[PDB]
DNA sequence: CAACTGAAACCGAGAAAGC
DNA sequence: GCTTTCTCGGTTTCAGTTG
């Protein structure tokens, strides 16, 4: 019983993250924005709030104690999805080289 | 992987300007010609950078479109970030006819 | 945006950590 | 076990510069 699976579902269903949307009706495939940050400018990442949310939920960032580190927050979730058996990247559907890019992930039941 | 690979390339002697500058095999000269300039030969001047792109798997002959400028960027940035290589900027001459950088190898 | 650059952001994968 | 994070060694983009 790991924490990432259900947490991530709740974030997509909430609709609080601009580009974090379902791609099918079954709610088993979804898009996650993935844009290369600027030099100390992480607002172009329309889902930067998502990476912060994961460090908050997991306690890896406690506001007022730790120094903000968005680049690291992004690496923690990248490595988390890669090593997860609950998610497989649909590399054929991922779109990294467009004006508003995203990865595509599917949920293994 | 980089430290031993670049040693082997210098030892090999396949690269005309890539030579040792001392007996201890701890300081070496690496050619660094600008691609647009007039005395630039695409074959030998891009050879070492391509060798690195091939060795690591980035470039694949007959499969990928050549991109010499990238190959050069790869190795430049790999030397900067490596703590196995510090540049001796006072010994480097990048603004002459036969330009070169100079690097020391930390053991 | 041709070639080029330093610095920052980025990456996979194995070891380490945590549960 | 069973899942996330840390460490390592380069790699690629960022925001310009001609290094």
Curated annotation (Swiss-Prot), chain A:
Induction of expression: Not induced by interferons.
Subunit structure: Interacts with the BATF-JUNB heterodimer. Interacts with BATF (via bZIP domain); the interaction is direct. Interacts with SPIB. Interacts with DEF6. Directly interacts with NLRP3 in the nucleus of Th2 cells; this interaction enhances IRF4 ability to bind to the IL4 promoter and is required for optimal IRF4-dependent IL4 transcription. Interacts with SPI1.
Disease involvement: Multiple myeloma: A malignant tumor of plasma cells usually arising in the bone marrow and characterized by diffuse involvement of the skeletal system, hyperglobulinemia, Bence-Jones proteinuria and anemia. Complications of multiple myeloma are bone pain, hypercalcemia, renal failure and spinal cord compression. The aberrant antibodies that are produced lead to impaired humoral immunity and patients have a high prevalence of infection. Amyloidosis may develop in some patients. Immunodeficiency 131: An immunologic disorder characterized by recurrent infections, including infections with opportunistic pathogens, and low IgM, IgG, and IgA serum levels, low plasma cell counts and abnormal T-cell subsets. IMD131 inheritance can be autosomal dominant or autosomal recessive.
Function: Transcriptional activator. Binds to the interferon-stimulated response element (ISRE) of the MHC class I promoter. Binds the immunoglobulin lambda light chain enhancer, together with PU.1. Probably plays a role in ISRE-targeted signal transduction mechanisms specific to lymphoid cells. Involved in CD8(+) dendritic cell differentiation by forming a complex with the BATF-JUNB heterodimer in immune cells, leading to recognition of AICE sequence (5'-TGAnTCA/GAAA-3'), an immune-specific regulatory element, followed by cooperative binding of BATF and IRF4 and activation of genes.
Transmembrane segments: none
Parent-protein residues present: 21 to 129 of 451
Gene responsible for this protein: IRF4
Similarity remark: Belongs to the IRF family.
Protein name, entry field: Interferon regulatory factor 4
PTM annotation, UniProt: Phosphorylation by ROCK2 regulates IL-17 and IL-21 production.
Compartments (UniProt record): Nucleus; Cytoplasm
Regions recorded as binding DNA: 1-109
Tissue and organ distribution: Lymphoid cells.
């Amino acid at each position: 019983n790991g924490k990432l699976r259900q947490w991530l579902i709740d974030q997509i269903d909430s609709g609080k993250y601009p580009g974090l949307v379902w791609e099918n009706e079954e709610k088993s495939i979804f898009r996650i924005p993935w844009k290369h940050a600027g030099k100390q400018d992480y607002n172009r990442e329309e889902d930067a709030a998502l990476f912060k949310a994961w460090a908050l939920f997991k306690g890896k960032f406690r506001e007022g104690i730790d120094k903000p580190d968005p680049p690291t927050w992004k690496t923690r979730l990248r490595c988390a999805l890669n090593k997860s058996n609950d998610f497989e990247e649909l590399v054929e559907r991922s779109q990294l080289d467009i004006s508003d890019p995203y990865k595509v992930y599917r949920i293994v039941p």
